[PDB]
Amino acid sequence: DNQFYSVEVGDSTFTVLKRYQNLKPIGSGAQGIVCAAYDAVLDRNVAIKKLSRPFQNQTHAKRAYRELVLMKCVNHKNIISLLNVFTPQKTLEEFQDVYLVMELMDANLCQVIQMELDHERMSYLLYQMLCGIKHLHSAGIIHRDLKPSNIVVKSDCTLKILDFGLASFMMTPYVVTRYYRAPEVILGMGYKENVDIWSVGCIMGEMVRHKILFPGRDYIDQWNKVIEQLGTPCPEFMKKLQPTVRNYVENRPKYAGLTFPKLFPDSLFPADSEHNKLKASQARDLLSKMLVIDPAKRISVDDALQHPYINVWYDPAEVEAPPPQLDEREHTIEEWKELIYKEVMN
């Protein structure tokens, strides 16, 4: 008569509540494996993520605690909803894993990118991406690490964001994606709201070109790709770089920089229609404003939402929603356990 049960999913063991049946591994990230499942109580499918020993290290603990907290207080339509949280362990001493049960989407953005999208769907997706980033910002949150994988969508094309970004040693087997990070992040410069716009621009560009814009083994290569395409940033920008960094970027082989109609030609945009020819120019325009190295010259979230390519989905009921301690600390794996544990069970 145990409230839980166990099943082997892939390699790890998922121990979940009885209400959740027929588990199917729908994915795997860095902080856990995610299975889809049916919730006999709510009569619907859901996604369950297992946080195995989230307190094993500050990187994982900080991430877990933070996500657990913000996912319970924040409430938006474009930010994955938290249905239920639980732990098969009965006490703080036995405590080991944390199961996050959420609503089940249909696919990853990485999958959507691998396909041609009409201006209607491409713009609607970008609108939701910005609609949410809008809320996250109003909630005092600035992602700074948005990427295709952390964004999920349904078939009806509705879009939702999974995590809340950063706030860092990781002795693990798998890498981290840096392709969609902003220059101020790649070079460390201090950021602001529009630091996420850079990520959105990296995605929109990939939704079109169908290939990762600025790929790279290290930030060395990544920054190279940034200039090889956009060109070397104006001298007004370099005087904001750390003297040690400035000395590195300035003394780097220059570039004139390709124009946008070059980077994103019409071959990538479906402009067989008089209506498509227009939207294609508009899309190419929002891109030329989002993919701007200089933060001071980059388009804000609010402007990108007033852009003719996006505004065609506006609605004061969606974007305009009411926003809600200081979870940016430093403890030990035994404290983090206590913190996370008590957070799990209110």
Ligand SMILES: CN(c1nccc(-c2cnc3ccccn23)n1)C1CCCCC1
């Ligand atoms: C870390 N993973 C993850 N974490 C939290 C939630 C979800 C999630 C929620 N609904 C769906 C539907 C399909 C695939 C994944 N999901 N996935 C990965 C993210 C990148 C794509 C594969 C799973």
